[PDB]
Amino acid sequence: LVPRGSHMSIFDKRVNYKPFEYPEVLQFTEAINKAYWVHTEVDFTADTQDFHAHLSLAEKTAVKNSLLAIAQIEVAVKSFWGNIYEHFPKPEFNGLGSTFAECEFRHSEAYSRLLEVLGYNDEFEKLLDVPVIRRRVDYLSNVLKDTKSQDNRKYMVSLILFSILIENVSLFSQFAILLSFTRFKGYMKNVSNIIAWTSIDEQIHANGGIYIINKIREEFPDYFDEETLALVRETVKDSIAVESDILDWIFEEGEIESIKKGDLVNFMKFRIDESLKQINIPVIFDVDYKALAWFEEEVFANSL
Amino acid sequence: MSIFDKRVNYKPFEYPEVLQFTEAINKAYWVHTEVDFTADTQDFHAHLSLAEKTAVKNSLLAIAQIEVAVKSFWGNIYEHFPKPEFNGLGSTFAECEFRHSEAYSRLLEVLGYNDEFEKLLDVPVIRRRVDYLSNVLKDTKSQDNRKYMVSLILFSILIENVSLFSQFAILLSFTRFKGYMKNVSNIIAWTSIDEQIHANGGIYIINKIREEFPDYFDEETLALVRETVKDSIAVESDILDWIFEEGEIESIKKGDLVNFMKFRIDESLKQINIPVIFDVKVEDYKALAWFEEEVFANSLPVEYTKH
Ligand SMILES: [Mg+2]
Ligand SMILES: [Mg+2]
Ligand SMILES: [Mn+2]
Ligand SMILES: [Mn+2]
Ligand SMILES: [Mn+2]
Ligand SMILES: [Mn+2]
């Protein structure tokens, strides 16, 4: 009932370990812990046989390019989460950061293994030859520009875009494409386990980011202004344009039976809008999205 | 390029042996919420003397002194060895340290030691321990690769490989010899394995640096390591006096613990080609040779009767 006249912010350093000022962190770490997995649990022999015998050029191409697009984000040093404590110096945020950081190394190892197993290391090494990828790297660098910024204004914008695009949306069209092969044709079941587990992790990461973003709004309403949002939406709209072109590239040998480009665009636009709601930003696209409403239950079924 | 130079391409790894350590952690993965201490609190209440209770309590406070903290070292090794595989190793060990801080924070909570832990700096020997630990860690953020390397050596051989291990040994002795504190010993056993993996990962890195920059291991560095370790062993010996402040206990003896620590130091020094310091006799280090066996035993549907 009684508001304090003064308090320490999320940007100030609490030295004592417990109690946690942001105890809900444990919901996110415990969810990662419960979902803990590594790629060494999985054998891809059946998938390679399905691939070899029963997929068309168009289908194989979608699988290859969807995995290349996933690896473009996942097979990399992704230092964001490991450094959040430099910005939010609370013990529980080192906990959240380190938990998500370790998770990202499990991801990089899993996708690095998939590239090896399917014989795409060469295409991956030369992926910057693809125009739409050069363009995705450009938008990603713009999300990431202020991730190590001492300016807390500019760090918070990096965090919104990281949480809403990179964690919640950039990969998810590829995850759906891959899951569709298992859903509708019963193929690539082992790849779909990896995909589903990654989806579960990434949703947790996105929500963790959202949580922090809302704690920052709850404490600093003034940085959540007019010109900030002009950056957010411009950047987001533009990011979808690039992800739409990624889909054109993924299906460059033709559309496939199990999933369609149009429905995936509405899937991404819907997912964005739904996360903007959660950080009290009004929607951009306002979406059709029932087409890929099966995603969440297919993730659950392939999680085992 | 060397271990200190950035490599952009994820694979192949230049230091592939990283995966032996991350895989070890993965296979040993655990969270404290797998363990319940109700039976331990009953053992403690009913079946431990004051002397024993005090050794349990003080061993746990000493462990918490190190474990219940933000331990930033492993999470930032990538800043010094900017390789994808060291970001992997770092983040894996960094997450492990958060599992540790939650485990020991929970133990303090359950046994009712939060207040004593808040006031732990009132203990003189704890302040001296804080002093040697701050000296070990002082250059952990250094841009000077030589200074940083020395902090790594001391971190690995003292803080990971030794500082905690006498407290681990004390706690496991209750389970081994009296069958008490079994669930505590599970946590201890799991922590012991983790910290051994951390220590060995540090040893791995140190030797890669030795291979690529043999000049860094100079006479001044070996002298500083040797002298710091000696001082640190003197402090840990005195920590044992405080641990047993209400009297000697039956399950384990200070003298065997000091020899255990000295031996562990020498074995780590050998692995990084630094002359041994204590040269402990086989008859002395065999006293706690059970340690490894007891770690293994405590690191691992329904059966019933009707009439
Ligand atoms: Mg860092
Ligand atoms: Mg020399
Ligand atoms: Mn990921
Ligand atoms: Mn992520
Ligand atoms: Mn630890
Ligand atoms: Mn450790």
Side-chain angles (χ1 to χ4, degrees):
Chain A
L1 204 175
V2 177
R4 232 164 90 75
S6 73
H7 51 63
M8 303 299 184
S9 75
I10 204 174
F11 301 97
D12 297 302
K13 186 157 170 281
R14 193 189 70 254
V15 302
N16 63 296
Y17 186 74
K18 287 259 183 83
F20 287 169
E21 293 173 298
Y22 303 88
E24 295 91 351
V25 161
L26 292 171
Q27 293 178 17
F28 303 100
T29 59
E30 292 169 20
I32 296 295
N33 295 356
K34 290 218 156 292
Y36 192 80
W37 64 277
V38 294
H39 73 83
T40 60
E41 295 175 52
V42 184
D43 175 16
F44 303 105
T45 303
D47 294 40
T48 58
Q49 296 165 356
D50 291 346
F51 192 94
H52 180 249
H54 290 122
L55 294 189
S56 63
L57 180 64
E59 287 169 327
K60 289 175 162 184
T61 296
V63 170
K64 166 180 161 278
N65 288 357
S66 289
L67 291 173
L68 285 174
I70 292 169
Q72 187 275 322
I73 291 181
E74 296 290 8
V75 179
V77 178
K78 295 154 280 172
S79 57
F80 188 83
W81 286 118
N83 289 320
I84 64 164
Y85 181 75
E86 299 295 324
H87 301 83
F88 312 113
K90 316 290 176 183
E92 61 270 36
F93 290 121
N94 177 253
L96 187 73
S98 72
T99 298
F100 286 6
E102 187 278 342
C103 173
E104 296 306 336
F105 185 64
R106 295 183 286 113
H107 292 183
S108 60
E109 284 303 288
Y111 293 99
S112 182
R113 167 90 182 288
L114 282 170
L115 295 182
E116 191 198 299
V117 156
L118 295 168
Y120 301 133
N121 290 341
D122 292 341
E123 285 92 331
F124 183 66
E125 291 165 52
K126 304 187 54 158
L127 195 59
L128 292 167
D129 296 352
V130 180
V132 66
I133 300 297
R134 288 205 295 283
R135 297 207 303 285
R136 186 153 85 163
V137 170
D138 288 348
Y139 101 64
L140 292 167
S141 299
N142 278 104
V143 169
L144 273 40
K145 64 183 154 69
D146 308 322
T147 49
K148 300 191 169 184
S149 179
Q150 302 287 107
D151 185 338
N152 296 348
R153 301 299 306 275
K154 298 188 169 185
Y155 178 77
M156 191 215 171
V157 69
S158 275
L159 175 64
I160 296 153
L161 300 167
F162 180 75
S163 309
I164 288 184
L165 298 178
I166 300 189
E167 306 295 75
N168 207 62
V169 181
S170 290
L171 273 19
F172 274 78
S173 75
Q174 301 102 270
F175 295 158
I177 291 162
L178 294 169
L179 266 20
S180 74
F181 284 92
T182 296
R183 188 171 176 80
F184 302 114
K185 308 196 149 206
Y187 295 146
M188 312 303 289
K189 290 212 203 304
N190 297 290
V191 171
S192 287
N193 285 146
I194 299 300
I195 291 290
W197 296 334
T198 310
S199 302
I200 293 167
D201 290 346
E202 290 303 322
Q203 192 54 67
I204 295 159
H205 297 172
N207 297 351
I210 286 163
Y211 169 75
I212 296 170
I213 292 153
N214 285 344
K215 298 313 303 192
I216 294 164
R217 290 177 54 251
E218 174 168 338
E219 295 174 31
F220 291 71
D222 68 296
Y223 301 161
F224 169 80
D225 70 14
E226 299 89 49
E227 279 77 51
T228 299
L229 280 42
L231 257 297
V232 166
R233 299 201 188 206
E234 184 217 322
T235 311
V236 166
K237 284 182 294 196
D238 287 328
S239 296
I240 289 299
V242 179
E243 292 300 326
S244 164
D245 294 5
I246 289 282
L247 270 10
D248 302 329
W249 173 68
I250 288 169
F251 298 116
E252 63 183 334
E253 294 288 359
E255 87 190 45
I256 59 174
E257 296 174 356
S258 57
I259 200 170
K260 298 298 179 295
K261 285 190 273 187
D263 301 6
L264 287 161
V265 167
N266 294 344
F267 177 70
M268 290 183 287
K269 290 177 174 171
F270 174 69
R271 285 181 63 86
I272 286 182
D273 286 347
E274 286 292 349
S275 66
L276 291 164
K277 287 181 170 189
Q278 291 172 249
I279 58 163
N280 207 296
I281 302 182
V283 299
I284 301 188
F285 304 97
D286 202 331
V287 179
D288 282 346
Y289 66 75
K290 168 58 204 264
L292 302 187
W294 61 260
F295 179 76
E296 283 79 357
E297 85 175 56
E298 193 64 22
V299 172
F300 183 94
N302 291 284
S303 81
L304 225 68
Chain B
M1 77 181 100
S2 87
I3 196 168
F4 301 109
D5 304 314
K6 174 173 270 209
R7 184 191 79 249
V8 180
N9 66 290
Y10 186 77
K11 268 185 186 168
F13 287 165
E14 292 174 285
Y15 302 95
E17 296 81 21
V18 162
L19 295 177
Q20 296 177 41
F21 302 100
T22 61
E23 290 175 6
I25 296 298
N26 296 340
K27 292 189 283 146
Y29 193 76
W30 64 276
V31 293
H32 71 97
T33 48
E34 299 175 58
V35 181
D36 187 277
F37 305 111
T38 296
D40 293 31
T41 58
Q42 302 302 71
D43 293 335
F44 192 88
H45 185 246
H47 297 306
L48 294 197
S49 67
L50 178 60
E52 287 168 331
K53 284 171 155 191
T54 304
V56 167
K57 177 176 67 72
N58 285 0
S59 295
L60 287 176
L61 283 166
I63 297 170
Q65 190 269 326
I66 293 182
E67 295 286 13
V68 180
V70 178
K71 291 151 288 171
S72 296
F73 185 81
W74 286 118
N76 285 301
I77 63 159
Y78 178 69
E79 295 302 323
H80 300 82
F81 317 111
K83 311 293 188 184
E85 59 270 46
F86 290 119
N87 179 60
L89 184 66
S91 71
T92 298
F93 286 1
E95 189 273 347
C96 178
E97 291 309 341
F98 182 62
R99 296 182 283 118
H100 292 182
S101 58
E102 290 298 290
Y104 292 97
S105 183
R106 183 61 184 159
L107 276 165
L108 298 183
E109 207 184 358
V110 167
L111 297 160
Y113 300 142
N114 291 359
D115 294 353
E116 293 81 339
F117 183 68
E118 289 172 38
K119 305 316 195 180
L120 202 59
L121 283 65
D122 299 341
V123 184
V125 72
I126 298 298
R127 290 196 304 280
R128 289 170 44 212
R129 202 203 209 184
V130 171
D131 286 350
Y132 96 66
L133 295 161
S134 310
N135 286 18
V136 168
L137 300 166
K138 76 185 171 187
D139 285 335
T140 49
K141 297 193 162 184
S142 185
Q143 297 279 36
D144 191 313
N145 294 335
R146 322 184 87 195
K147 291 185 185 180
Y148 180 73
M149 187 203 62
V150 175
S151 81
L152 174 59
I153 285 168
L154 288 165
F155 181 77
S156 307
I157 73 183
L158 278 164
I159 302 188
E160 301 303 72
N161 197 66
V162 174
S163 301
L164 295 179
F165 274 77
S166 73
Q167 299 109 83
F168 297 161
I170 290 164
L171 293 167
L172 298 174
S173 80
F174 283 98
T175 299
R176 187 173 180 80
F177 295 109
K178 307 187 82 164
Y180 297 139
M181 312 306 289
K182 284 201 153 65
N183 297 286
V184 169
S185 289
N186 283 332
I187 298 296
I188 296 294
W190 292 338
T191 307
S192 289
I193 292 164
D194 290 345
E195 286 319 309
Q196 197 62 73
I197 297 164
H198 298 172
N200 295 0
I203 287 164
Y204 168 79
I205 294 171
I206 290 159
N207 283 334
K208 293 289 144 147
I209 297 164
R210 192 149 57 84
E211 170 171 26
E212 301 176 19
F213 296 89
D215 290 351
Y216 285 9
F217 291 75
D218 55 22
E219 295 89 342
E220 292 91 331
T221 297
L222 268 58
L224 183 60
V225 173
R226 271 169 130 269
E227 292 300 305
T228 304
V229 164
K230 279 173 90 164
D231 292 352
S232 302
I233 295 308
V235 172
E236 294 290 344
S237 302
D238 291 356
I239 283 166
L240 298 174
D241 293 330
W242 166 75
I243 287 175
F244 303 123
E245 66 186 341
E246 294 296 340
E248 143 177 7
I249 65 173
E250 200 185 14
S251 56
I252 201 170
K253 312 299 175 172
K254 173 173 180 188
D256 296 330
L257 285 166
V258 171
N259 288 326
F260 171 78
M261 291 188 293
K262 288 171 165 173
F263 178 72
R264 285 180 69 81
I265 284 291
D266 283 346
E267 292 292 287
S268 68
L269 291 173
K270 279 186 198 174
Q271 287 189 71
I272 57 172
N273 199 53
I274 291 184
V276 302
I277 299 172
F278 306 101
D279 187 44
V280 177
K281 305 183 279 190
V282 69
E283 74 197 25
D284 292 331
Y285 70 73
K286 279 286 176 197
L288 301 191
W290 60 258
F291 183 73
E292 282 77 16
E293 172 186 310
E294 196 66 25
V295 165
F296 180 93
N298 289 276
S299 70
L300 187 153
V302 174
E303 286 180 45
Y304 68 97
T305 297
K306 180 145 65 146
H307 303 201

